Design a protein around this ligand. Structure first.
Ligand SMILES: Nc1ncnc2c1ncn2[C@@H]1O[C@H](COP(=O)(O)OP(=O)(O)OP(=O)(O)O)[C@@H](O)[C@H]1O
Lengths: 199, 181, 67
C-alpha cells in the first residue's frame, strides 16, 4: 500500500484544483513560509477523518473552505480525494485502488465517499483503524510529537509510548465503565433525594 | 416507606458494579502488559537508531518507576558523539530534536506503517546533522513511503522528487514539481 | 544564498526574450544546485516577478519574466 495521488480543490489556500502524484520513495514538499505547503498535511489529515481542530490547524468549516483573497472570492465547497494503491490488499477492500473523499459545503453539509460510494465518516475511520492506520499510528508526524517527547512533564512523554502500545481502546473502555459506575450511583442518589422529600 | 422499585435499583447497581469492576481490572491488565511489551521492543532499537542519526554515540531508555507500569514515565539518556552521556533534559536544542526523532523512528520499527507524513519534524536539527536524517529516510524508504514537508535543504537533496507550493497569486497556492531521481 | 540565485535567474531572463526551460537555466546542474534553483523560482513566483507554465506533474517547466 502507498499514497498515489492527493487531489485538493477549495480546501484552505488551494482555491483551484491541485493534484500531487507521490512517488514510492521520498516525496518532499517545499516552498516559502505561509505559501501553503503544510496545508498538504492538513488535507491528508482531514480526508482521513481527522476532526480535531487543533490537529487540523483549524478544523471548522470556515477554516476548511477557501475563504477568499485579493485574488479570488471565497468558495462554497471544499473537496479532497486521496487515492491509495491497494495492490497488496493492505486495506480490507476488494479494489485495486482505494479512493477516499471528503467534502464540506458552506451550508455545513458534509459528504464522505470510499471508491465514489457515499458512506459515513465512521466508515473512513474504521477502514483505516482496522488496517492498523488509526489515531495511534505514526503515519502522520508533525512537530507536536517532537514537543511531546521533549516535554518536562512525564505524562506527556508516556503518552507517546502508550500510542505505540495501542492502549487507547482499553483506556477508553475503562473510562466508559468508570463513568457507568458513577452515573448509576448518581442516579440512585438523586432518586433517594426525591423520595426523601416525599417523607 | 420502602419501595420495591428502589430496592431493585440498588440491586441492579450492585450487580453492574461486579461485572464493571472486572472490565476495569482487565483494561488495567491489558494496558500494563502492552505498555511494557512495546517499551521493551522500542528500547531494543533505540541505541542503533540513535547512532545512525548522530553518526556515533549511544543512548538508552529507562522506566522512571519500573514497578508502576500504569503510570511510570520514561527517562531518555543519550550521548551524542563527542559529548557526555546525559539525560535528554540537558542536551542541546539540536541534540534534543534529533534524539526525539530517533525515538520516533524506533517506534516506527516496532509499529511500522506503509506511508509516513513528516511535517517539518527536523526543523530544529543542527545543520551538520540534517544529512544523516535525510539519508535515514532514503535508506528506509524501501519499506515506508515518506512524504516530507521540509524547509531544510539537506532533506530536499535526498528526496526523489520535490513539490513546490507557492502563492503566485495573492492567497492562492500553486503547485509545481521537479524530479531529482 | 537563495536570493543570490534569484537575481541570477532574473538577469538571465532579460537575455532570452522568450520561454526558458527550467533545466536550461543552468546546464547539467547538480542536485544541490537544482534545489536552490527550484526554491528560487518558487520565491520569484511569490514576488510576482516571473510566470510559470507546467502541464503535468514532473513535466517540463517553462519560465518567463514578468516586469
Ligand atoms: N480557509 C483558508 N482560506 C484561505 N487561505 C487559508 C485558509 N486556511 C489557511 N489558509 C492559508 O493557507 C496558508 C497556510 O500556509 P502554510 O501552511 O504553508 O505555513 P504557515 O501558515 O506558516 O503554518 P505553520 O506556522 O504551521 O508553519 C496561510 O496563508 C493561510 O492564511
Amino acid at each position: 500500500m502507498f499514497l498515489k495521488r492527493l487531489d485538493v480543490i477549495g480546501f484552505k489556500s488551494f482555491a483551484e484544483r491541485i493534484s500531487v502524484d507521490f512517488v514510492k520513495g521520498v516525496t518532499a514538499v517545499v516552498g516559502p513560509n505561509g505559501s501553503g505547503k503544510s496545508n498538504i498535511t492538513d488535507a491528508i489529515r482531514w480526508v482521513l477523518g481527522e476532526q480535531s481542530a487543533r490537529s487540523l490547524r483549524g478544523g471548522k468549516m470556515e477554516d476548511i473552505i477557501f475563504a477568499g483573497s485579493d485574488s479570488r472570492k471565497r468558495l462554497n465547497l471544499a473537496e479532497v480525494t486521496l487515492t491509495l494503491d491497494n495492490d497488496d490488499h493492505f486495506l480490507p477492500i476488494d479494489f485495486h485502488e482505494v479512493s477516499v473523499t471528503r467534502r464540506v459545503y458552506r451550508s455545513g453539509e458534509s459528504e464522505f465517499l470510499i471508491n465514489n460510494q457515499p458512506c459515513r465518516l465512521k466508515d473512513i475511520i474504521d477502514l483505516f483503524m482496522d488496517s492498523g492506520l488509526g489515531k495511534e499510528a505514526f503515519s502522520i508526524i508533525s512537530q507536536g510529537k517532537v514537543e511531546e517527547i521533549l516535554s518536562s512533564k512525564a505524562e506527556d512523554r508516556r503518552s507517546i509510548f502508550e500510542e505505540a502500545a495501542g492502549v487507547l481502546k482499553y483506556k477508553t473502555r475503562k473510562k466508559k465503565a468508570e463513568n457507568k459506575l458513577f452515573e448509576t450511583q448518581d442516579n440512585l442518589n438523586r432518586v433517594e433525594d426525591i423520595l426523601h422529600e416525599l417523607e | 416507606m420502602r419501595y420495591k422499585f428502589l430496592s431493585e435499583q440498588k440491586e441492579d447497581l450492585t450487580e453492574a458494579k461486579n461485572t464493571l469492576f472486572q472490565v476495569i481490572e482487565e483494561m488495567d491488565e491489558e494496558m500494563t502488559k502492552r505498555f511494557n511489551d512495546t517499551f521493551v521492543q522500542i528500547r531494543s532499537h533505540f541505541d542503533q537508531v540513535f547512532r545512525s542519526l548522530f553518526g556515533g554515540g549511544r543512548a538508552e531508555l529507562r522506566l522512571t518507576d519500573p514497578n508502576d507500569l500504569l503510570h511510570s514515565g520514561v527517562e531518555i539518556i543519550a550521548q551524542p558523539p563527542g559529548k557526555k552521556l546525559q539525560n535528554l533534559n540537558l542536551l542541546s536544542g539540536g541534540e534534543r530534536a534529533l534524539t526525539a526523532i530517533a525515538l520516533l523512528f524506533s517506534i516506527l520499527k516496532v509499529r511500522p506503517v506503509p506511508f509516513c507524513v513528516l511535517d517539518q519534524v527536523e526543523a530544529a536539527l543542527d545543520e551538520a546533522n540534517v544529512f544523516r536524517f535525510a539519508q535515514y529516510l532514503k535508506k528506509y524508504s524501501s519499506d515506508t513511503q515518506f512524504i516530507v514537508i521540509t524547509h531544510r535543504k539537506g532533506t530536499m537533496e535526498e528526496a526523489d522528487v520535490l513539490y513546490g507550493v507557492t502563492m503566485q497569486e495573492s492567497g492562492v497556492s500553486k503547485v509545481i514539481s521537479v524530479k531529482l531521481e | 544564498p537563495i536570493e543570490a540565485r534569484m537575481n541570477e535567474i532574473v538577469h538571465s531572463l532579460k537575455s532570452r526574450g522568450t520561454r526558458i526551460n527550467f533545466m536550461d537555466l543552468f546546464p547539467y546542474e547538480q542536485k544541490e544546485h537544482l534545489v536552490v534553483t527550484f526554491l528560487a523560482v518558487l520565491e520569484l513566483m511569490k514576488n510576482q516577478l516571473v510566470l510559470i507554465e507546467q502541464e503535468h506533474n514532473f513535466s517540463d517547466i517553462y519560465i518567463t519574466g514578468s516586469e
